[PDB]
Symmetry: D2
Subunit: 205 residues, 4 copies
Amino acid sequence: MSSLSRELVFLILQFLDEEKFKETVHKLEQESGFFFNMKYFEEKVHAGEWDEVEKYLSGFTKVDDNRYSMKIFFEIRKQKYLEALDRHDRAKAVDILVKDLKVFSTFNEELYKEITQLLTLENFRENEQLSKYGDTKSARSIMLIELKKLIEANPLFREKLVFPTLKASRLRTLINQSLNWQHQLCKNPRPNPDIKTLFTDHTCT
Amino acid sequence: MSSLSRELVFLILQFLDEEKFKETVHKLEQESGFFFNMKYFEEKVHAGEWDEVEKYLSGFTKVDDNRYSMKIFFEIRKQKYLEALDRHDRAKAVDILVKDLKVFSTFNEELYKEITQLLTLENFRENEQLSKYGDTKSARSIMLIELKKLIEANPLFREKLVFPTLKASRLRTLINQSLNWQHQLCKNPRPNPDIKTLFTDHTCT
Amino acid sequence: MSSLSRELVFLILQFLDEEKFKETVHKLEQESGFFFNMKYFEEKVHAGEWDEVEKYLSGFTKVDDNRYSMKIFFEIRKQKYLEALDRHDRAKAVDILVKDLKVFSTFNEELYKEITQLLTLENFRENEQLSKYGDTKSARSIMLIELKKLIEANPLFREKLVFPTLKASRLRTLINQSLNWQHQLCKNPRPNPDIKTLFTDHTCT
Amino acid sequence: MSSLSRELVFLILQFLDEEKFKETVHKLEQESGFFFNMKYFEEKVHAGEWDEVEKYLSGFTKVDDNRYSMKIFFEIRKQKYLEALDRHDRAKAVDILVKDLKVFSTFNEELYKEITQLLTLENFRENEQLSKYGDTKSARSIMLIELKKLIEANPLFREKLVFPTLKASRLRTLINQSLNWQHQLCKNPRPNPDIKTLFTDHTCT
Ligand SMILES: [Zn+2]
Ligand SMILES: [Zn+2]
Ligand SMILES: [Zn+2]
Ligand SMILES: [Zn+2]
């Protein structure tokens, strides 16, 4: 990608945002990987939308890319696991444990064991290190504080967190310059003409 | 929305498509509801991605909007139900039947009953009207033929199926006209300058 | 079986009952099929022990033996089904419906359909014929009244419901007569000897 | 219980066995706890009937009564757990692990952990100590060899494994002695009379 093309994506993001296409904004953030939307991230975390949270992240980093990004995924999964335990759905908890969390065992063998053993407890708050886990809403919120730090420290992000500030609807302004450029080639030009389309250059007569 | 704004969305779609952002294209198709992508629809149907198929459709129509759109949803769900029956997951099949299909009972009470009764069969091919259902891949394909017709007949679609043909990267061309417009205001203009950004108007000196 | 042998079973039942071997009594009732214990039946019905209720019955009748015995099984299963629906375990309810209840469809096709359709309801009390079903304990109790009638009318039972009245521990009394018979063959007999065993005839000297 | 009464149970067992009441024999073995039927035990083990195996045992010992009986239960459960893992029903495996096996953790904390960790494996034969587990039929059989030893060594059993040998239908013989005793009191006695019943003493005239 040129830096032109890259910048154009940003204009487009602005536009989509202003046109209130909320889902389309975040697919583009993700697919381009140019801007990570914290506010959106927090929102989805709080809503416990784990499939989308992982999906959004996946446009910025893979699980093993570096240590920050590995802890980020680990934390998210862990919470997924615990919520399953709370609703006493141990069938799900197990599914998570093997499918999502097993990848982390290589890096710490003993912690994986210790987390596995939570399955056998009447309440995982019987573990003193997890004795603090209060309700879902709260755990999510406390975890979010941690994720924000991890992300801001992550070198794969650090340059993606701040939307370059620019005049509203820059794209629309640029578009206009092109319609003005089209008519200024018209001769003999009417003073104020009608636009046939954006699709093909305007003309007068 | 102005017709300007509407047309601009199309340029954007073209661009996103050319930049190979495939997911972002289809979110925008859906959220704008301006263009229904048949090819994409077929693809997702074949892949049995039912959650996304319904989601994509939902940008163009609700289930009860008209008779075509109601049969479209009905057909899709029905297949969802049958696939559940085939993998002998009758727990899912039941979930579908009450959650997704019940809405259709008002409109036909007896058919809902008749579909409900398929649960009790060793194989639903014991019903002669379903005796034809061959493998998944085939049923999907035959159903697709039916959906295509339903959609092309649906008045909510009929004006959304054909992408207005236009020169490649029209958006990029327009952008350029604006950079040319910017420099042509430069005086004394250098002959060929460097672009500082798309974000704020270019200048020379 | 001789009527001797048959009568001996009854003595044995008395004995087991007096020795408080409760499970062994009812296996013998079932396996011999000579006596149906109403009190036990009521108890198990109330406790919702369906697997044992069907098992106990199976020593007296099969499902299709006659019309009374067919309604008895049907009623029991139906309640099994409804209880599954109440705990909103529709996966179980379906399992019951195909495995246990399907056998009854031959005899009434339409009722099977009507019962099948209860799966789709938010609450099966939406059916006015089932609008009466109050709590489990109550439904069981009302159903029990019905079962008692069905059983007392069932010709396969009618001659099995009343335990022939007899002196306590008749078996023990008979045993004694045999030990008295053994010693009365002893000569020269001591007046009051010790029993070596029941296993082989007693002797003196 | 008198030793009379105890011996009478044995006669009864013989009788029930000869009358082919197979279920009633084993309920009585269990409820009396006087005789443990190895052959029956092997049979049920091979058939993987775990609920009945534990039930039968429960008439002879509780889980914590002594060390042999504790290993016996542990072994049985462990196999239950592994079979669940093989059919890849990890929901069941977990159910077993917490409900049945947790009791054993007190006595060995680390082994419980090590067994818990088998849940996360693609195949538990990845553990070299379980690398030997071949098919179900075989594992059951090898385990049976082990159980037989454990039982024969268990002091709660050691005196319960051998059925005292006695003439066929001893009970029937004893019964007869009582009918002979009844008629020998008849005077004037007919030479060969008819038995009115076993229920009340016979008489002549
Ligand atoms: Zn013009
Ligand atoms: Zn310039
Ligand atoms: Zn004597
Ligand atoms: Zn006599």
